[PDB]
């Protein structure tokens, strides 16, 4: 699908509210496999199961290994911009 830019707002006591799978070592993008109800990704409205996360706050995630992506994603705070695409 089309590449989208999506804003997520979260407070410091929360996680993103997603599960991810995939990663470069598996030959696939970082993929959202769950959107947890009521948590920030759900609340922001623009992130969905099946989205590939291409970047976060300008950090490319296209060739990142699974755990690299976990570290990068969990470091982001506050107003967080995602670049995502549904395939």
């Amino acid at each position: 699908g089309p590449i989208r830019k999506v804003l997520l707002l979260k407070e410091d006591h929360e996680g993103l509210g997603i599960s991810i799978t995939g990663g470069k070592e598996h030959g696939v993008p970082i993929l959202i496999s769950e959107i947890h109800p009521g948590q920030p990704a759900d609340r922001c409205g623009g992130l969905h199961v099946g989205d590939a996360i291409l970047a976060v706050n300008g950090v490319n995630l296209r060739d990142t290994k699974h755990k690299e992506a976990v570290t990068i994603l969990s470091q982001q705070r506050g107003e967080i911009e995602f670049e995502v695409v549904y395939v």
């Binding site: 799978t21 696939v28 947890h36």
Partner: peptide, 7 residues
Amino acid sequence: RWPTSIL
């Protein structure tokens, strides 16, 4: 099989 992480 791929890993899954909750974040």
